[PDB]
Design an enzyme around this catalytic site. Structure first.
Site, short mmCIF file in Angstrom:
data_model
loop_
_atom_site.label_atom_id
_atom_site.label_comp_id
_atom_site.label_asym_id
_atom_site.label_seq_id
_atom_site.Cartn_x
_atom_site.Cartn_y
_atom_site.Cartn_z
N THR E 33 52.53 43.88 40.16
CA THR E 33 51.74 45.04 39.82
C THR E 33 50.52 44.66 39.00
O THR E 33 50.38 43.53 38.53
CB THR E 33 52.58 46.05 39.04
OG1 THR E 33 53.05 45.44 37.83
CG2 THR E 33 53.75 46.53 39.85
N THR E 34 49.65 45.64 38.82
CA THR E 34 48.42 45.50 38.05
C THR E 34 48.60 46.11 36.67
O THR E 34 49.40 47.02 36.46
CB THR E 34 47.28 46.21 38.78
OG1 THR E 34 47.19 45.70 40.11
CG2 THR E 34 45.98 45.99 38.08
#
Ligand code: ADP
Ligand code: ADP
Ligand code: ADP
Lengths: 258, 257, 12, 242, 246, 249, 273, 234
Positions: E33-34
């Protein structure tokens, strides 16, 4: 067949990049050949089996049409050989009469011998014949829309002869796909057979694990059959589930504690 | 060529592949309408393999008698690799025999040294071996999809063969064969040692318990050595213990290498 | 022919 | 290899466990031995592989090995490992006699020393006991004779006679012929001429090589004199006259 | 270290002096994920893309953030649980500090601990490195800070941060933003300036929808403590940043 | 790949490349390589039975023991190997007396095997968080049996994999499947102890490698009256005696 | 064999020294030694020298040595052969090595003529006491070479030059002077030495702009001696891809920046002294 | 195909980043059977079918108590469940004599997620190969969570696992805004949460004993409806 450029997925990134390396071999000699600058005379490249490299190879010939005859090194392995090595050298002046047709060799060189020594059996006549058919050749920017080439299994194992790496080194590892890609590939291989649409490959797209491109063709060709294995004209789409594992069969035998 | 005369009753064994070899032998031949609504003529042509003498031969033979099927005896390296002139010239005559022939099947064996390895560009090399190989590959896709003929090949070792010619559309499947469990070991004494002077009321699984991983055709020798001891007694007829004495001689008396 | 077999070679 | 479960842990696809069947595959390279229980007596025997007449005759470390007045032990194969089992058995004897105020049985003993080996092959950083042994002698104040055989896998199985080590299969078939659960030998000298005679096939008439004890009620333990033995070695050979 | 080589096991310097068992990890977090970390002129703020992988998930039910004792915000990336591990060590040791020296925890000496516990999982042979890229930023009398975390321990002090599959995309804006604001923004406004990132970063993955969560810590707004933000604030933001990107 | 097992067997605590870990299943086979056993459900009692492998005519075959009591009202059989089985017995019966001390009543049987089948998972992981005690797993398929209040006459089938099922009848050994078939179509719901004891011998005369007598099988019973015991030879030489007329034709 | 009768392809063809940079002194260290016997041989007899026999190169690859290996052909007009130190071995023992006798004699029947030999590390081992069943074969294949250049068979009026990217591992018995009487290292040059090499490509193709090098070449402290021909074409490779067929100093920058990190990801492997 | 290394232990990353052994653990539970459930705002359910060996044998036990305000199921290995269960009872017991402000559901996941982490980095040990399902209840109401050996605990409405599961979760995704709007009607969501389990299986007779359910709510203590009392709920 005259299938499209793509037939493979949404890999515009490579192909729309690739043939930019082949426009100059195809055309553009007005200032290119007035610039006289380097020209990859057959974009030989690589990537182990599983890919649609033959399709990327052949589909690129959808624009540069090419007769269906493409013979490989296993044609060049006979008794007191050399007439086959004659064939390859004549192969292009033959085609150089008038044709953008371009054949596609295929090389698993030491797939018959060992490689304990890096000093290797870079095969006899290919390593010889490939030179003259590459050194003394141009395309004239018309009726030579591409340049004949080949491809191999793994770029670590070769004895690069003169100009084997001098100019002809345009090459990419085809990046294996992802879930956004994959589910639209197997879609293609069901364009001829329809099924219960209750579970898309987008549903599958998280369930894949370690699947290269070729063997995915071994999915619906069976899982389309695993349905009609029970003679349902209405093709079910969970037969994929118990057929995908038939890649190696899992030795599934009466799971005791699990 | 027109009758092998060997049944399902002839076969004990695992037996399960035959209902899978009951796939393409029939629907192309009898009823694609079961699959006409989705991908008509969906099968195109298959292959066999297994270790030596696991009934890989006997399996296809078990079904050529069925369907009024009519197969061939010019097989493998025996009769076409040895006395040789224009092998494909026979094949052109072969399909010329087979161009309109019906209820017939190709099948042959021995294909390790025939078209398995391409000589690796050594061992002296041979070209007629390939041309007649390819000459089939020409005749292969002539009308088989819309037509009705089938194709079946066999190997002791598939991956030892050539994978080069495996361009799909030309090829579909290679099915495996291994040794059976005891039940496949069970119903074969019911045929092999059947045809022998033996006493009745005899349990034929304890031997199956006591002959683990092993193929079938040696049991014929176990039979051949079973009926050896009333002899040795100058007695007449086979007990069951005679097996046990024989099994001692031939498994642990054979595993030594 | 006018010959028969005889040879030698390395292994690796 | 503190822990590490090297290959003792790794079962086989056949089921066996390599290093164990390996062990008693190694044991047969050592000196044979034998045991018998007749009507009232129990008997044992071993050999000495031929030395150059230098193997010290007086204080040789022998095969019979006492525990108390009423129990002994003979064994086969490896020797450095034999000496600890002999120790951590008689340890438990002096202990068992103490904290229970009465001596050992034999069905208490073979359970221990057959159970010990299992811990030396179901643990980490341990090699098994490449050895096979048997027990012999009476329980207290009881006429009954007993011997128990045990081997490195950890199983103990009683017997009436048995042999361990080298060329036992050349021997035990002789004993099943003569010895029988029908009817014992009468008394001491009967077992012995039967006992000794069975050896002779691997013996080259080395009477010096073979060494014998007996066991009797009331713990009348004893080893016997080479003359007393040798005068059996000959008259038994006097019977060869045919 | 291609085969018959050195990359497989830890603590074996490949002959260019590298632990190729490590640099496989940073691809792992790169396959995750970011998330981001920003320095307000008076504190910090964080963010993350929560990832709908199905419809059956509940907003504001399964966070992707934990927290230090009172103030030090901490995020995750790549793998969560390995992240969740050392955050239990985060809350742990800072209490050993507090009980002893009678105060809260400063952030530089904090990394002096957490920048070694992971380093001390690099040097043995019988362990694995934390496959993450953590961020933590907070406040103190000497002001505020932000610290990115790499598994080998190469933690520095940033003013803007990024991770995940959208780094070169996202961090570009963080550079293309700050040059237009040498002032250093206050708290509420950098929020929407950052949510601009995530609804832009997700462009990779348009097969799906998603959602996010937000952090908040500053002097003028929390007394310099950590929390999330709810109500009209972030709702005025997500439509705003979504409005000004079409 | 080419070698799914041999390239991942040596890793004792390693899951396969297809999910089902290895050394357990290598440990689940050898139960067959030993010697069969058998036991049956019944409301007026329970029966157990084995062979004993009369190897040579010297072994006093009353001495071998594929069968033993846990307590007054529980009995267990064995299979496969036996050196690795004493340890579970020496731990198993310990619980019953302990349950008859801390709680002072008589112990259940379902509350027993859980504290037996857990014990054979100490390798690799542990049961209640504890680390490990022993290198390798150990293969003996056991057959407990015992009366209780809540459920009455029961048996279970242990397994070193940590599984166990309340069979109503189950065999062991390489001849298990060769007979367990034969029981499936024979076990009724309202049988007697005796005819079951007459039943079980049908298999042993069927399955066994050699003609049986007193000194090739033995048996053991259960009653809420007596609890648990065994049958001496002459008793075994009488149920077999009047066995035959039932097969006179 | 006929294979010796195949290698000789461009025995003369002149690609002269103006098309090279960076090496104005190595060639001063080499135009000295080779041509003089083959130009004015009596000097070494004027002065009393046992003339040289043998040279080589060393340094990392993709650097321009093979050009030098042929650039001398332009000066001479005389003969030349190209050949590796790899495509020699085969199954039948000795057949690999017999060839070596076949060829030095083949030099003697037509000269002025000399030899090149690549990648000699394959034939560049230290003769080991212990060995495999076969690796000693190349060692016995080697020492024929070790012989023939200085063996009992006298020699004159022919020359050999070899090259590697791994000077170590070599049998010192080769390195005996007399078997080769001067060494040299060709390095990755300095920026200016990297700068003539930059412009020679512009010297051929249609330049348009002013110099704009000194800052471009500020990045040039990383390259090799041969990645720039790629770089030179790579500028026009996509200056044109906008169908702009008149090149600029605008577009190479995207190229020359690009190549460095794609080169980085598998570069700087080793240097070999 | 061809062998891979990097699987030999649970410590080596792949060249990509996978812990290749971990996925082989998670393999087992799709290779294993199914145990599913869903959520109401006032109730929530477990359900799972059974297996056997033969007809003589009983079925596996698959759903396990841990307290009144919590219970769970499993799908996979049997041992690892007891490890967690025999562990998990202790904390919901531990809070009930030290704080006696009963244990909530979500933090239970947040500590046993951290269990598996510790047993997936060291050497000497092995990963607990199960993906189990769990429910609860608290001041926050009822919930429903999922487990993986990764440590990825996730709070949810409903979920399916095991083989032949996709259609059932797929049924649930198709049928979402309906079963949860209710409250005080436990015996009707299950009627949707059974035909859910009618997705993909054979079950050609009275699935009376092949099946078992427990449930809790704002009032309902954890009790496992098993036996023919379940038969009505078919
Ligand atoms: N990405 C892909 N999309 C669709 N088909 C693919 C893909 N990759 C491989 N294939 C399948 O593999 C075959 C083409 O493989 P090819 O390029 O010939 O590889 P190889 O040359 O190693 O055989 C075709 O049957 C094609 O359907
Ligand atoms: N289940 C079975 N039923 C009958 N015969 C069997 C069975 N399994 C093996 N066989 C034996 O195996 C042999 C098969 O021979 P074949 O397949 O021709 O050899 P190969 O496999 O080397 O070509 C036959 O002799 C047959 O008796
Ligand atoms: N100094 C140089 N001048 C011109 N071209 C060079 C130079 N150095 C290397 N090259 C380029 O390198 C390639 C071959 O050089 P070569 O002599 O083979 O070096 P190497 O032997 O290290 O590969 C040619 O394409 C050439 O253009």
């Amino acid at each position: 067949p005259t299938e499209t450029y793509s037939d493979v997925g949404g890999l515009d990134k490579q192909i729309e990049e690739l043939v930019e390396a082949i426009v100059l071999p195809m055309k553009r000699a007005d200032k290119f050949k007035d610039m006289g600058i380097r020209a990859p005379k057959g974009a030989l490249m690589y990537g182990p089996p599983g890919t649609g490299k033959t399709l990327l190879a052949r589909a690129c010939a959808a624009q540069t049409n090419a007769t269906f005859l493409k013979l490989a090194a296993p044609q060049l392995v006979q008794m007191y050989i050399g007439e086959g090595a004659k064939l390859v050298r004549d192969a292009f002046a033959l085609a150089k009469e008038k044709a953008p047709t371009i054949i596609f060799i295929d090389e698993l060189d030491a797939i018959g011998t060992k490689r304990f020594d890096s000093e290797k059996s870079g095969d006899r006549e290919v390593q010889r014949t490939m030179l003259e058919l590459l050194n003394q050749l141009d395309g004239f920017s018309s009726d030579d829309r591409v340049k004949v080439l080949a491809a191999t299994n793994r770029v670590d194992v070769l004895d690069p002869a003169l100009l084997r790496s001098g100019r002809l080194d345009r090459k990419i590892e085809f990046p294996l796909p992802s879930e956004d890609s994959r589910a639209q590939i197997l879609q293609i291989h069901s364009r001829k057979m329809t099924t219960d649409d209750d579970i898309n490959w987008q549903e599958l797209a998280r369930s894949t694990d370690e699947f290269n491109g070729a063997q995915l063709k071994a999915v619906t060709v069976e899982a389309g059959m695993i349905a009609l294995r029970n003679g349902q004209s209405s093709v079910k789409h969970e037969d994929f589930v118990e057929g995908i594992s038939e890649v190696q069969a899992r030795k599934s035998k009466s799971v005791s504690f699990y | 060529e027109e009758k092998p005369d060997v049944t399902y009753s002839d076969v004990g064994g695992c037996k399960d592949q035959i209902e899978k070899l009951r796939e393409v032998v029939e629907l192309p031949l009898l009823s694609p309408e079961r699959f006409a609504t989705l991908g008509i003529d969906p099968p195109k042509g298959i292959l066999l393999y297994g270790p030596p003498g696991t009934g890989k031969t006997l399996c296809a033979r078990a079904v050529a008698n069925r369907t009024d099927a009519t197969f061939i005896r010019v097989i493998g390296s025996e009769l076409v690799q040895k006395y040789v002139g224009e092998g494909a010239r026979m094949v052109r005559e072969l399909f010329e025999m087979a161009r309109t022939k019906k209820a017939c099947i190709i099948f042959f064996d021995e294909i390790d040294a025939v078209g398995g390895a391409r000589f690796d560009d050594g061992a002296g090399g041979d070209n007629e071996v390939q041309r007649t190989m390819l000459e089939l590959i020409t005749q292969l896709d002539g009308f088989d999809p819309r037509g009705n003929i089938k194709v079946m090949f066999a190997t002791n070792r598939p991956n030892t063969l050539d994978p080069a010619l495996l361009r799909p559309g030309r090829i579909d499947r290679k099915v495996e064969f291994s040794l059976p469990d005891l039940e496949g070991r069970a119903n074969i004494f019911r045929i092999h040692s059947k045809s022998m002077s033996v006493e009745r009321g005899i349990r034929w699984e304890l031997i199956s318990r006591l002959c683990p991983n092993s193929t079938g055709a040696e049991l014929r020798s176990v039979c051949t050595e079973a009926g050896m001891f009333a002899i040795r007694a100058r007695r007449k007829v086979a007990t069951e213990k005679d097996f046990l004495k024989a099994v001692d001689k031939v498994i642990s008396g054979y595993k030594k290498f | 022919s006018a010959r028969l077999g005889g040879a030698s070679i390395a292994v690796q | 290899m503190s822990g590490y479960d090297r290959a003792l842990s790794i079962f086989s696809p056949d089921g066996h466990i390599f290093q164990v069947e390996y062990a008693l595959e190694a044991v047969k390279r050592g000196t044979c031995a034998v045991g018998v229980k007749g009507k009232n007596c129990v008997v044992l025997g071993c050999e000495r592989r031929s030395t150059l007449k230098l193997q010290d005759t007086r204080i040789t470390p022998s095969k019979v090995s006492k525990i108390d007045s009423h129990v002994v032990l003979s064994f086969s194969g490896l020797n450095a490992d034999s000496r600890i089992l002999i120790e951590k058995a008689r340890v438990e004897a002096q202990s068992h006699r103490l904290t229970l105020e009465d001596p050992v049985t034999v069905e208490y003993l073979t359970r221990y020393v057959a159970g010990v080996q299992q811990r030396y092959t179901q643990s980490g950083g341990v090699r098994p006991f490449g050895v096979s042994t048997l027990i012999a002698g009476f329980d207290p104040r009881d006429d009954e004779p007993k011997l128990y055989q045990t081997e490195p896998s950890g199983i103990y199985s009683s017997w009436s006679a048995q042999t361990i080590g080298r060329n036992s299969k050349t021997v035990r078939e002789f004993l099943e012929k003569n010895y029988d659960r029908k009817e014992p030998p009468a008394t001491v000298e009967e077992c012995v001429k039967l006992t000794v005679r069975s050896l002779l096939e691997v013996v080259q008439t080395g009477a010096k090589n073979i060494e014998i004890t007996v066991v009797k009620p009331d713990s009348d333990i004893v080893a016997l004199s080479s003359e007393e033995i040798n005068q059996y070695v000959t008259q038994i050979e006097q019977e060869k006259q045919e | 270290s291609i085969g018959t080589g050195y990359d497989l096991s830890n603590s074996v310097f490949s002959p260019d002096g590298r632990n190729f068992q490590v640099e496989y990890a940073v691809k792992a977090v790169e396959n995750g994920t970011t998330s981001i970390g920003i320095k307000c002129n008076d504190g910090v703020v964080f963010a993350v893309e929560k990832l709908i992988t199905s419809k059956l998930l509940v907003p504001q039910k399964n966070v992707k953030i934990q927290v230090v004792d009172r103030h030090i915000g901490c995020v995750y990336s790549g793998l969560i649980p390995d992240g969740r591990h050392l955050v239990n060590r985060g809350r742990e040791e800072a209490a050993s500090f507090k009980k002893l020296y009678k105060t809260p925890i400063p952030i530089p000496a904090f990394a002096d601990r957490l920048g070694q516990y992971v380093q001390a999982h690099t040097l043995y042979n019988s362990v694995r490195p934390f496959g993450v890229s953590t961020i933590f930023g907070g406040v103190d009398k000497n002001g505020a800070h932000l610290y990115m975390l790499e598994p080998s321990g190469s933690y520095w002090g940033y003013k803007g941060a990024a991770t995940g599959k959208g780094r070169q995309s996202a961090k570009a804006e963080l550079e293309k933003l700050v040059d237009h604001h040498p002032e250093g923004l206050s708290a509420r406004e950098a929020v929407k300036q950052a949510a601009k990132i995530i609804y832009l970063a997700h462009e990779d993955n348009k097969e799906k929808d998603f959602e996010l969560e937000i952090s908040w810590c500053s002097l003028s707004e929390t007394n310099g403590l950590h929390k999330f933000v709810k109500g009209d604030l972030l709702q005025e933001a997500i439509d705003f940043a979504q409005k000004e990107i079409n | 790949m080419f070698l799914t097992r041999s390239e991942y067997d040596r890793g004792v605590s390693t899951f396969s490349p297809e999910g089902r870990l290895f050394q357990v299943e290598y440990s689940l086979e050898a139960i067959k390589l030993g010697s069969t056993a058998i036991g049956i459900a019944t409301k007026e009692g329970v029966v157990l039975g084995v062979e004993k492998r009369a190897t040579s005519p010297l072994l006093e075959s009353d001495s071998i023991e594929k069968i033993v009591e846990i307590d007054r009202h529980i009995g267990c059989a064995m299979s496969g190997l036996t050196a690795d089985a004493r340890s579970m017995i020496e731990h198993a019966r310990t619980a019953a007396v302990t349950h008859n001390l801390y709680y002072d009543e008589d112990i259940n049987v379902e509350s027993l095997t859980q504290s037996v089948c857990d014990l054979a998972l100490r390798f690799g992981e542990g049961a209640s968080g504890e680390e490990r005690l022993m290198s390798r797993p150990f293969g003996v398929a056991l057959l407990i049996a015992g009366h209780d209040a809540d459920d009455g006459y029961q048996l279970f089938h242990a397994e070193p994999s940590g599984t166990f099922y309340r069979y109503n009848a189950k065999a062991i050994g390489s001849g298990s499947e060769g007979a367990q078939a034969e029981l499936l179509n024979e076990w009724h719901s309202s049988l007697t102890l005796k005819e079951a004891e007459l039943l079980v011998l049908k298999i042993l005369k069927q399955v066994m490698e050699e003609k049986l007598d007193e000194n090739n099988a033995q048996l053991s019973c259960i009653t809420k009256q007596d609890g648990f015991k065994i049958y001496d030879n002459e008793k075994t030489a009488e149920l077999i005696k009047e066995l035959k007329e039932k097969e006179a034709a | 064999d006929p294979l010796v009768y195949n290698m000789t392809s461009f025995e003369q063809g002149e690609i002269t020294f103006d098309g090279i940079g960076g090496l104005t002194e190595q060639i001063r260290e080499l135009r000295e030694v080779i041509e003089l016997p083959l130009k004015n041989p009596e000097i070494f007899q004027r002065v009393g020298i046992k003339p040289p026999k043998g040279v080589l190169l060393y340094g990392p690859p993709g650097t321009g040595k093979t050009l030098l290996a042929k650039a001398v052909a332009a000066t001479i007009g005389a003969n030349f052969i190209f050949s590796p130190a790899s495509g020699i071995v085969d199954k039948y023992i000795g057949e690999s090595a017999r060839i070596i006798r076949e060829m030095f004699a083949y030099a003697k029947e037509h000269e002025p003529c000399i030899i090149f030999m690549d990648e000699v590390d394959a034939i560049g081992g230290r003769r080991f006491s212990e060995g495999t069943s076969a690796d000693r074969e190349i060692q016995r294949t080697l020492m024929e070479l070790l012989t023939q250049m200085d063996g009992f068979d006298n020699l004159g009026q022919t020359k050999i030059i070899m090259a590697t990217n791994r000077p170590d591992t070599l049998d010192p018995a080769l390195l005996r002077p007399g078997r080769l009487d001067r060494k040299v290292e060709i390095p990755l040059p300095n920026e200016a030495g990297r700068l003539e090499i930059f412009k020679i490509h512009t010297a051929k193709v249609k330049k348009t702009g002013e110099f704009d090098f000194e800052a471009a070449v500020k990045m040039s402290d990383g390259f090799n001696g041969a990645d720039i021909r790629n770089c030179a074409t790579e500028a026009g490779f996509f200056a044109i891809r906008d169908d702009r067929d008149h090149i600029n100093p605008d577009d190479l920058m995207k190229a020359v920046r690009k190549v460095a990190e794609v080169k980085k990801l598998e570069g700087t492997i080793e240097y070999q002294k | 195909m061809f062998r891979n290394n990097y699987d030999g232990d649970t410590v080596t990353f792949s060249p990509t980043g996978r812990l290749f052994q971990v996925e082989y653990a998670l393999e087992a539970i799709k290779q294993g059977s199914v145990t599913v459930g869903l959520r109401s705002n006032t109730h929530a359910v477990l359900v799972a079918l059974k297996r056997n060996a033969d007809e003589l044998s009983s079925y596996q036990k698959k759903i396990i108590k841990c307290d009144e305000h919590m219970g769970l199921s499993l799908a996979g290995l049997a041992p690892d469940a007891r490890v967690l269960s025999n562990y998990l009872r202790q904390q919901c017991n531990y809070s009930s004599l030290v704080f006696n402000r009963k244990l909530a559901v979500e933090r239970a996941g947040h500590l046993l997620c951290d269990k598996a982490q510790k047993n997936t980095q060291s050497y000497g040990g092995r990963p607990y190969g199960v993906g189990l399902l769990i429910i609860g209840y608290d001041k926050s109401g009822a919930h429903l969570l999922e487990f993986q050996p990764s440590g990825n605990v996730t709070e949810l409405y409903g979920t399916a696992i095991g083989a032949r599961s996709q259609g059932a979760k797929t049924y649930l995704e198709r049928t979402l805004d309906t079963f949860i709007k209710i409250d005080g009607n436990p015996d009707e969501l299950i009627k949707a949460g059974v035909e859910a389990i009618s997705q993909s299986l054979r079950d050609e007779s009275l699935t009376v004993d092949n099946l078992s359910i427990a449930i809790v709510g704002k009032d309902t203590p954890f009790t496992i409806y098993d036996g023919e009392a379940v038969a009505k709920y078919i």
